[PDB]
Amino acid sequence: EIQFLRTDDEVVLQCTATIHKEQQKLCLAAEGFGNRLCFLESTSNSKNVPPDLSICTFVLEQSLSVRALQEMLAN
């Protein structure tokens, strides 16, 4: 009944802002071409300004354990 985040699923990372006693919802965005630095795209003001979700989505490839990751990195 409750869905589980599984690998190969496309997701967006959202964080909440409490600036000046206002709940602002922001997503983690990055433009791979050009500036590699990540920035935030606001999604709480979708009524006034459309969010650019095209560059805020990530795909979860692997969910290896810590020990399995260490063995990966050793080998």
UniProtKB/Swiss-Prot annotation:
Gene encoding the protein: RYR2
Entire-sequence positions represented here: 10 to 84 of 4967
Tissue-specific expression: Detected in heart muscle (at protein level). Heart muscle, brain (cerebellum and hippocampus) and placenta.
Compartment(s) of residence: Sarcoplasmic reticulum membrane
Modified how: Channel activity is modulated by phosphorylation. Phosphorylation is increased in failing heart, leading to calcium leaks and increased cytoplasmic Ca(2+) levels.
Superkingdom of origin: Eukaryota
Disease: Ventricular tachycardia, catecholaminergic polymorphic, 1, with or without atrial dysfunction and/or dilated cardiomyopathy: An arrhythmogenic disorder characterized by stress-induced, bidirectional ventricular tachycardia that may degenerate into cardiac arrest and cause sudden death. Patients present with recurrent syncope, seizures, or sudden death after physical activity or emotional stress. CPVT1 inheritance is autosomal dominant. Ventricular arrhythmias due to cardiac ryanodine receptor calcium release deficiency syndrome: An autosomal dominant arrhythmogenic disorder characterized by syncope, cardiac arrest and/or sudden unexpected death, often in association with physical exertion or acute emotional stress. Patients who survive manifest polymorphic ventricular tachycardia and ventricular fibrillation. Unlike typical catecholaminergic ventricular tachycardia, arrhythmias are not reproducible on exercise stress testing or adrenaline challenge.
Domain notes: The calcium release channel activity resides in the C-terminal region while the remaining part of the protein resides in the cytoplasm.
Function noted in UniProt: Cytosolic calcium-activated calcium channel that mediates the release of Ca(2+) from the sarcoplasmic reticulum into the cytosol and thereby plays a key role in triggering cardiac muscle contraction. Aberrant channel activation can lead to cardiac arrhythmia. In cardiac myocytes, calcium release is triggered by increased Ca(2+) cytosolic levels due to activation of the L-type calcium channel CACNA1C. The calcium channel activity is modulated by formation of heterotetramers with RYR3. Required for cellular calcium ion homeostasis. Required for embryonic heart development.
Name of the protein this chain belongs to: Ryanodine receptor 2
Induction: By TGFB1.
Assembly behavior: Homotetramer. Can also form heterotetramers with RYR1 and RYR3. Interacts with FKBP1A and FKBP1B; these interactions may stabilize the channel in its closed state and prevent Ca(2+) leaks. Interacts with CALM and S100A1; these interactions regulate channel activity. Identified in a complex composed of RYR2, FKBP1B, PKA catalytic subunit, PRKAR2A, AKAP6, and the protein phosphatases PP2A and PP1. Interacts directly with FKBP1B, PKA, PP1 and PP2A. Interacts with SELENON. In cardiac muscles, identified in a complex, composed of FSD2, CMYA5 and RYR2.
Cysteine disulfide partners in this protein: none
Family: Belongs to the ryanodine receptor (TC 1.A.3.1) family. RYR2 subfamily.
